[PDB]
Amino acid sequence: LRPISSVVFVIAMQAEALPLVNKFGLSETTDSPLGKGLPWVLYHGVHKDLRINVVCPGRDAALGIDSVGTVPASLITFASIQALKPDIIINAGTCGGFKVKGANIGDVFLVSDVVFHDRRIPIPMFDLYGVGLRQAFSTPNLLKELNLKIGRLSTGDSLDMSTQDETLIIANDATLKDMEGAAVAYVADLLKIPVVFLKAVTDLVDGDKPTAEEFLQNLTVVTAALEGTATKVINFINGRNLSDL
Amino acid sequence: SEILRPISSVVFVIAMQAEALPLVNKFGLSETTDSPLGKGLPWVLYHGVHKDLRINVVCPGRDAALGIDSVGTVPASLITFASIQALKPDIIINAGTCGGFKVKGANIGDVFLVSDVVFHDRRIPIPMFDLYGVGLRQAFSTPNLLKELNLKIGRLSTGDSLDMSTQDETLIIANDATLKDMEGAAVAYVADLLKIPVVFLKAVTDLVDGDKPTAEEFLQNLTVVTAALEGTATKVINFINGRNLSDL
Ligand SMILES: Nc1ncnc2c([C@@H]3O[C@H](CO)[C@@H](O)[C@H]3O)n[nH]c12
Ligand SMILES: Nc1ncnc2[nH]cnc12
Secondary structure (H helix, E strand, O other), rough: OOOOOEEEEEEOOOHHHHHHHHHOOEEEOOOOOOOOOOOEEEEEEEEEOOEEEEEEEEEEOOOOOEOOOHHHHHHHHHHHHHHHHEEEEEEEEEEEHHHHHOOOOOOOEEEEEEEEOOOOOOOOHHHHHOOOOOOOOHHHHHHHHHHHHEEEEEEOOOOOOOOOOHHHHHHOOOOOOOOOOHHHHHHHHOOOOOEEEEEEEEEEOOOOOOHHHHHHHHHHHHHHHHHHHHHHHHHOOOOEEHHHH | OOOOOOOEEEEOOOOOOHHHHHHHHHHEEEOOOOOOOOOOOOOOEEEEOOOOEEEEEEHHHHHOOOOOEOHHHHHHHHHHHHHHHHOOOOOHHHEEEEEEEEHOOOOHHHHHEEEEEEOOOOOOOOOOOOHHHHHEOOOOHHHHHHHHHHOOOOEEEOOOOOOEEEEEHHHHHHHHOOOOOOOOOHHHHHHHHOOOEEEEEEEEEEEEEOOOOOHHHHHHHHHHHHHHHHHHHHHHHHHHOOOOOOOO
């Protein structure tokens, strides 16, 4: 009955956030509400029955690059939920895709469920824990109306892929590969907040181009594709309750 | 405007509750009940006082789905972050059992004072992201503690897998680590962000490059090495009491 009134986006790279920030005329938060001295970046605004916040892990103090990976994504997810109390979290970002699973460069995917491929604990019941299978929040009307591809996401802290990473990714029949998604899901689960994922394919994992080269090659164009979908997602959510999608 | 004075509190971050209990029992710490780190969470906080020092012990506690300790970097980073913001420690101590390399001088039962920490499972083959993924961070300098306790020293390497792949081993060898665990580097990352001094006590329960233990060996090492960790942690607590950060 209660319509959604607050959405938080978790975005690992500032360059990925800006197109969205601009589209909705969000402004950069200036008062460090999640903690003094942190590198994190927050953008806030209202549109129109929705509060919108976009949080980023920010840059490494020493090295200057975006603080990608599961640990920072978990912290900002935790901190933003506790400060802002959103109705729903959306982790938006780029990812690798498998052509064999129907993924094409530029595709923006909704996520059915998520796993980790780099948390291997070979004791029964710890094994399941490491893999961390979690379902994204059910959004069938959004899926239908926006006509998005959907598949399983597999997460780990490496941009390349080890043999053992591949083994787990395949065993879990993942379509998509990223560096934050399963950890955002773990935190959303822990704090009982619906989570949805938008994952935009920059590189083909089963393809013939090197991962880092292809990722970097397509980042800009694919991020604009990600913006277009995230914009339609916000517009759809507005005025709806969680049951509506 | 700021005059420096003795440390007033410490928080221990301990991944597995069984590792924490002997320290809790030794100092008669009480398990808190007023949700100090947030309502509706499985995290456990123990609180007490030893002489002039306030002692907080934080554990990620049991996983809702499966009921096991919530091991690994993500939960460790969360409880570290939340306990710093709520509890305002002067210093954080990541204490726990870990794997070791006999080729690097480690033995079963040794409790190491970690010099510095890295990740072995954050591989990002792009300039400046590569270094970021490795995440090299120095532990807080504690020379007088080391003169007193004479713990072995070594680099710690962290990742979310309990086993070791060849890819894992390659980074661990490249980074010249003596110790292998599942939380330390992530604890250091959070400690760094919030500018809190961090120390690590890492007790070798298994030799990553040594012969497989027997059953009676496995269990014995688990009792005796956890007891060794408690004995060392107790000595650190008695040592830190009444000291400024600069005296250690
Ligand atoms: N093939 C791939 N593997 C893992 N992550 C990514 C990404 C995403 O882009 C960032 C790369 O550090 C990170 O946020 C990750 O989630 N794009 N392509 C990927
Ligand atoms: N061998 C090992 N590797 C990683 N984490 C551990 N924790 C305890 N023993 C370990």
